[PDB]
């Protein structure tokens, strides 16, 4: 909207109230939009014997279809946008402007792979609040999209050549960060909830759990046409907004089909005092705030008058 001449501004994408607002907004859209047949949430207020809260309600089958949302300044505030093409997300931004609203952000809820988002303008970008801390998520932003085509018949397809090319570019970025003498290894999820261990997303209103092992099984700096991931549509789901469980009715459509563009990844690295010269990276995700961060990293909200 208007580029602030000769202004330097500090950003911190890891402490951004815009992310918190978007998180609460998306959580609300889901409550009012998706209705489970049964939902369970815990209640163990240190009283001893727990009391699970159980809600049972009409369970209509509805195709969910994420619509771009724009965030404009809240009353009394302004939105500053960083213009540095390859901004890491945390630090001084020299080329900053004021905008009326953010760009249109599709609120896609998923684990492991970020879908239908924004691409990096120059090279692949990796971001973390602390690269030294193995417990912190690493957000990967691709500069080229990879198609992933999924069907309710139980699989997803990805071009092996394209995926190979993107892995190479991600690994190059990772050793640029952790050591240019490092073998970069990709492995499957270590474990946890099903929504965490598989690439989890929604398509045609249904929850897909696709095994991503074939995507994360390679070593860098050390049949073959399409990668076909085995998929499962599930009815009993762990809630992402709060701790709890939701149950949905089985599918009613015989033709569930989605094609998405992979535009980023959520990764975690294996820590450890292993003085080996290799870093192990596994697909991660689960905190949807990281999904929103991947789009909001270039914005901050500042008090005006």
């Amino acid at each position, epitope marked *: 909207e208007v580029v602030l001449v000769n202004v330097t501004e500090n950003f911190n994408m890891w402490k951004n109230d815009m992310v918190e607002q978007m998180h609460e907004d998306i959580c609300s859209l889901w409550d009012q939009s998706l209705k489970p047949c049964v939902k369970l949430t815990p209640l163990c207020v240190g009283a001893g014997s727990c009391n699970t809260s159980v809600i049972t*309600q009409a369970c209509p089958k509805v195709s969910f279809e994420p619509i771009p949302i724009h965030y404009c300044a809240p009353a009394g505030f302004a939105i500053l946008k960083c213009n540095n093409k390859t901004f890491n997300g945390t630090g001084p931004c020299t080329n900053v402007s004021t905008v009326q609203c953010t760009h249109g952000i599709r609120p896609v809820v998923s684990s492991q792979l970020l879908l239908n988002g924004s691409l990096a303008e120059e090279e692949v970008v990796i971001r973390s609040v602390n690269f030294t801390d193995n417990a912190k998520t690493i957000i990967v932003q691709l500069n080229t999209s990879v198609e992933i085509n999924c069907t309710g018949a139980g699989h997803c397809n990805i071009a092996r050549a394209k995926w190979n090319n993107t892995l190479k570019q991600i690994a190059s970025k990772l050793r640029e960060q952790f050591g240019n003498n490092k073998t970069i290894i990709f492995k499957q999820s270590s474990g946890g909830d099903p929504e965490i261990v598989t690439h989890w997303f929604n398509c045609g209103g249904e929850f897909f759990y696709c095994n991503s092992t074939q995507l994360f099984n390679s070593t860098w700096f050390n049949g073959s046409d399409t990668i076909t991931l085995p998929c499962r549509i599930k009815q009993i789901i762990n809630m992402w907004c709060k701790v709890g469980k939701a149950m949905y009715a*089985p599918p009613i459509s015989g033709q569930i089909r989605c094609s998405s563009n992979i535009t980023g990844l959520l990764l975690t690295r294996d820590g450890g005092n292993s003085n080996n010269e290799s870093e192990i990276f596994r697909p991660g995700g689960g905190d949807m705030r990281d999904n929103w961060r991947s789009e909001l990293y270039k914005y901050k909200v500042v008090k005006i008058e």
Partner: antibody
Amino acid sequence: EVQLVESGAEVKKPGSSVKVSCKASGDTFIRYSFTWVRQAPGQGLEWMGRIITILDVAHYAPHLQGRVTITADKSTSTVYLELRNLRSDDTAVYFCAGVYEGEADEGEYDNNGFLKHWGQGTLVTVSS
Amino acid sequence: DIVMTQSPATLSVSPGERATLSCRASESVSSDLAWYQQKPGQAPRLLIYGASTRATGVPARFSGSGSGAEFTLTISSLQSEDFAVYYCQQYNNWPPRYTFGQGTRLEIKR
């Protein structure tokens, strides 16, 4: 396949409570939902309620809501029906029934409302 | 509050002939309709679910049809062991309030 074996006949005074049980064996307990159905002498079948075993969540017929409780003990693969404040008209044969729901432990659940497997029935007589 | 009605209350059929049983719902139940057979002193036995799917162990002479609010159970040729009481069951609503018809008694005509 699951085999359902129920507890023995009960005789109660009006106002008493009763707890009948149903032992399910032969398959994986949490992959089944269990339903209680009663039949008064000379009458037809009446659905009382159904427990989604994996969720530990039961739903009851409206005319019974409040005085019926269905539970499941996963450790002993046993389903229980408790009926409170018994009335003479609660005299009936009480059947435990069940159906396979899919790989519930892997989050697959068809929520089937029909009843494939049946216990032998328990006579509950409520009389002064 | 879905009421299931079966007709007729009693059907008399000569051995080896066809029998057709009817079940009506007070509102649509889609295809969430099951049929049970019950003999005196025994538990009910599932014959048909999803309106037209034969349960395991059920002979081919039993056939279910219909959808919405109107259903039929057909027995192609009655054997000695088919004479029983037959019940229909609606399981379409959620939260679940499942209901049964009052049964059709199939008797031997002589």
